[PDB]
Design an enzyme around this catalytic site. Structure first.
Site, PDB file in Angstrom:
ATOM      1  N   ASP B  25       0.830  -1.202   0.000  1.00 14.10           N
ATOM      2  CA  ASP B  25       0.000   0.000   0.000  1.00 14.10           C
ATOM      3  C   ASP B  25       0.872   1.263   0.000  1.00 14.10           C
ATOM      4  OD1 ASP B  25      -1.948   1.956   0.378  1.00 14.10           O
ATOM      5  OD2 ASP B  25      -2.908   0.957   2.095  1.00 14.10           O
ATOM      6  N   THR B  26       1.170   1.816  -1.181  1.00 13.52           N
ATOM      7  CA  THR B  26       2.069   2.976  -1.189  1.00 13.52           C
ATOM      8  C   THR B  26       1.406   4.234  -0.642  1.00 13.52           C
ATOM      9  OG1 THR B  26       1.534   3.353  -3.543  1.00 13.52           O
ATOM     10  CG2 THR B  26       3.479   2.057  -3.023  1.00 13.52           C
ATOM     11  N   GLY B  27       0.094   4.232  -0.557  1.00 10.86           N
ATOM     12  CA  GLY B  27      -0.638   5.328   0.024  1.00 10.86           C
ATOM     13  C   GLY B  27      -0.779   5.272   1.526  1.00 10.86           C
TER      14      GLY B  27
HETATM   15  C1  YUJ Z   1      -6.684   1.232   3.446  1.00 12.42           C
HETATM   16  C2  YUJ Z   1      -6.620   0.786   1.982  1.00 12.42           C
HETATM   17  C3  YUJ Z   1      -7.047  -0.680   1.878  1.00 12.42           C
HETATM   18  C4  YUJ Z   1      -7.550   1.655   1.134  1.00 12.42           C
HETATM   19  N1  YUJ Z   1      -7.133   3.046   1.146  1.00 12.42           N
HETATM   20  C5  YUJ Z   1      -5.966   3.562   0.443  1.00 12.42           C
HETATM   21  C6  YUJ Z   1      -4.762   3.714   1.377  1.00 12.42           C
HETATM   22  O1  YUJ Z   1      -3.570   3.923   0.675  1.00 12.42           O
HETATM   23  C7  YUJ Z   1      -5.002   4.937   2.250  1.00 12.42           C
HETATM   24  C8  YUJ Z   1      -4.844   6.227   1.433  1.00 12.42           C
HETATM   25  C9  YUJ Z   1      -5.022   7.409   2.375  1.00 12.42           C
HETATM   26  C10 YUJ Z   1      -3.798   8.219   2.691  1.00 12.42           C
HETATM   27  C11 YUJ Z   1      -3.887   9.407   3.606  1.00 12.42           C
HETATM   28  C12 YUJ Z   1      -5.191   9.764   4.256  1.00 12.42           C
HETATM   29  C13 YUJ Z   1      -6.431   8.964   3.945  1.00 12.42           C
HETATM   30  C14 YUJ Z   1      -6.355   7.778   3.002  1.00 12.42           C
HETATM   31  N2  YUJ Z   1      -3.973   5.011   3.243  1.00 12.42           N
HETATM   32  C15 YUJ Z   1      -4.259   4.827   4.640  1.00 12.42           C
HETATM   33  O2  YUJ Z   1      -5.354   4.629   5.056  1.00 12.42           O
HETATM   34  O3  YUJ Z   1      -3.088   4.857   5.390  1.00 12.42           O
HETATM   35  C16 YUJ Z   1      -3.149   4.766   6.872  1.00 12.42           C
HETATM   36  C17 YUJ Z   1      -2.288   4.007   7.308  1.00 12.42           C
HETATM   37  O4  YUJ Z   1      -0.967   4.746   7.178  1.00 12.42           O
HETATM   38  C18 YUJ Z   1      -1.400   6.154   7.448  1.00 12.42           C
HETATM   39  O5  YUJ Z   1      -0.781   7.143   6.280  1.00 12.42           O
HETATM   40  C19 YUJ Z   1      -1.781   7.506   5.554  1.00 12.42           C
HETATM   41  C20 YUJ Z   1      -3.033   7.390   6.386  1.00 12.42           C
HETATM   42  C21 YUJ Z   1      -2.649   6.224   7.384  1.00 12.42           C
HETATM   43  S1  YUJ Z   1      -8.428   4.085   1.190  1.00 12.42           S
HETATM   44  O6  YUJ Z   1      -7.937   5.425   1.038  1.00 12.42           O
HETATM   45  O7  YUJ Z   1      -9.202   3.808   2.400  1.00 12.42           O
HETATM   46  C22 YUJ Z   1      -9.402   3.746  -0.244  1.00 12.42           C
HETATM   47  C23 YUJ Z   1      -9.084   4.382  -1.581  1.00 12.42           C
HETATM   48  C24 YUJ Z   1     -10.000   4.036  -2.735  1.00 12.42           C
HETATM   49  C25 YUJ Z   1     -11.173   3.088  -2.526  1.00 12.42           C
HETATM   50  C26 YUJ Z   1     -11.433   2.448  -1.199  1.00 12.42           C
HETATM   51  C27 YUJ Z   1     -10.554   2.813  -0.039  1.00 12.42           C
HETATM   52  C28 YUJ Z   1     -12.605   1.565  -1.263  1.00 12.42           C
HETATM   53  C29 YUJ Z   1     -13.049   1.549  -2.758  1.00 12.42           C
HETATM   54  C30 YUJ Z   1     -12.209   2.528  -3.504  1.00 12.42           C
HETATM   55  O8  YUJ Z   1     -11.379   1.904  -4.402  1.00 12.42           O
END
Ligand code: YUJ
Lengths: 99, 99
Positions: B25-27
């Protein structure tokens, strides 16, 4: 190019004639962008992740340019705290993970 | 390996001697795993995602092997919808984005 992950992988995108900053996000199935009043039809959706769900507007066949790489696909618009480019568009610009 | 993004980048991890599936998860800045038993001390922590903030158990300096690559770092344990491997460990295994 090659992007290391010491910091968030933030890039400039062009969408709806506007430039924004977004994360290249391998953990997102689809692309989610900050509230923007795009033209055209849309359908409501709920998307969930850490902390719960947010309500978004699903727009289809939207043109986005990501680091000069053009893509076209679904964009979900709503009160997301961060703009994420998801796999639906990352595949289109030829993005891989490598280690 | 080189991992394309037509499918979720799911891999097998080994943590606490148990195998699990997790998403590259690069995000994600941080690594967050679903509820599980891990040995050692932990500190209450908060982390925010797309839908708000959750309470997690923070385990420091935890051995975790990701697709055959070893890391030692911080693992957050809590009610995440999905086991995610974040940048704190992706950097350890040498993961980059490339397009
Ligand atoms: C958790 C993943 C499985 C799904 N996410 C994507 C992750 O990369 C999220 C991105 C993000 C980054 C910064 C703030 C908010 C979000 N990162 C995340 O939560 O990181 C945690 C842990 O580390 C911390 O640093 C960042 C935040 C903390 S999502 O954003 O919930 C998503 C997107 C599209 C879609 C869905 C769900 C459902 C359908 C559609 O496709």
């Amino acid at each position: 190019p090659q992007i290391t992950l010491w910091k968030r992988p933030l890039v400039t995108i062009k969408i709806g004639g506007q430039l924004k900053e977004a994360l290249l996000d391998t953990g997102a199935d689809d692309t989610v962008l900050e509230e923007m009043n795009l033209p055209g039809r849309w359908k409501p959706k709920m998307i969930g992740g850490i902390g719960g769900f947010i309500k978004v507007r699903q727009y289809d066949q939207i043109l986005i340019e990501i680091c000069g790489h053009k893509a076209i696909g679904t964009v979900l618009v709503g009160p997301t705290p961060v703009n994420v480019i998801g796999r639906n568009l990352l595949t289109q610009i030829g993005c891989t993970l490598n280690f």
